[PDB]
Structures are given as C-alpha cells and as structure tokens.
C-alpha cells in the first residue's frame, strides 16, 4: 500500500496539534477506565461507561484523522516510515507526537465489540516488524499478540481466516515475503513470522480458549502502548 504523500504531508503540518487533542482523549478514556476497572467486563461495557456522546466524539476525531491524513490501515506504521525514504524525511523529527496519535488509535480500538481489534493488531505487528534493536519490549508484543489471537478466534461470529490473511489484512504490505524486506533484525533472526503462523494455527485448533479478562486486557494494552511511547522507533 502507498501512503498518500499529499495527505501524509498534511499530517506533518497538523502533527503536534492533532497529537494534542489525541492525548486529551487518551487521558479521559484512561481516567474513566481507572474508576471502573472491574465493572468494565467487555468492550460494550467500556462503551456504555464512556457515554454515547463521548464515544461519538471519539469516532469522529478518529474519522477525520483517518480520512484527512490518509491512514488507510487505521493507524501509523513506524516500520513503513522507517523503510521509505520520502516518509522518513517527512517524519523523522515528529516521532514523539506520532506515538501519541497511534496511542489514541490503539486505545479506542478497545471499543470494538467484535473483538477483531484490527488497529491493535496493526500496532503490535508494526512493533514486531520495527524491532531490530535489543529489547524485551518485543516479548510484551508477542504476548499481546497471542491475546489478540485468542480474542479473535474465541468469538464465534468471526470467520475462520488463515495466518496470512490475519497478518496482512492489517498491514500496508502485500505479502509475507515483503515483510522480510521491511522488518528489523528480530523478525528475520528469531523467525518471528513462523512463530505467529504457529501461534495462530494452535489457538484456532485449541478447545481451550483461556482468554484474559477485559480489564486485564485493557491494562495490558495501555501498558504496552505506554512502553512503545517512550521507545525511539525512527532509527
Ligand atoms: Co493465556
Ligand atoms: Mg495488506
């Protein structure tokens, strides 16, 4: 996929500002989650507690973000930005506010009552693709990845899909091979793709669906988006 260069260019201009409104809604959603960390039993409950108007506003801000700035895969891809020179130059300075925008796109995806969490899937895979650097922040991404896998295949209204489709449908890349072209060291070195294809195969075969509790899921998501937020991804 090609990120519209004009729209991405607009994002450079409105970056710090959209980032600010973004961190507003994060602090809200996160504060509201702090009150009810045991009554929020599922995304739908997260929704009711937030309020329709808060929710409606949440989706409208995400809509403008998505349409105006060309984010076809719903969020920001640091692997993509690091890979393609034109985008690197455009964004190399703006890593801090980019992390904020992505956080927002991650957090509100917790509201997806289909449990597909396409945006969280994107963010986790992007993290997995980005890391060459020595980190155990990787480990956390693998774990969160297995949870998203449970959440997807544990919901019986979600169609059976291959590991390939599960991975690529949320990435601005066209094939599994292509991922080898844009990834960091860890992806190739630890044969990460095979681990994911394995995990995905076993989770949809297993009668055990040891899904985590939502408030624990949410807390792990918030935690993970926070670690990400103090990591230097752009080279
Ligand atoms: Co588990
Ligand atoms: Mg794709």
UniProtKB/Swiss-Prot annotation:
Organism: Schizosaccharomyces pombe (strain 972 / ATCC 24843)
Subunit structure: Interacts with taf1 via the Myb domain, and ccq1.
Residue ranges of coiled coil: none
Domain of life: Eukaryota
Protein role: Regulates telomere length and function. Required for the repression of telomere-adjacent gene expression and for normal meiosis or sporulation. It may be a negative regulator of the telomere-replicating enzyme, telomerase, or may protect against activation of telomerase-independent pathways of telomere elongation. It may be involved in the interactions between chromosomes and spindle proteins, disruption of these interactions would lead to defective meiosis.
Name used for this protein in its record: Telomere length regulator taz1
Residues with the Phosphoserine modification: 206
Subcellular location: Cytoplasm; Nucleus; Chromosome, Telomere
Parent-protein start and end of this portion: 127 to 361 of 663
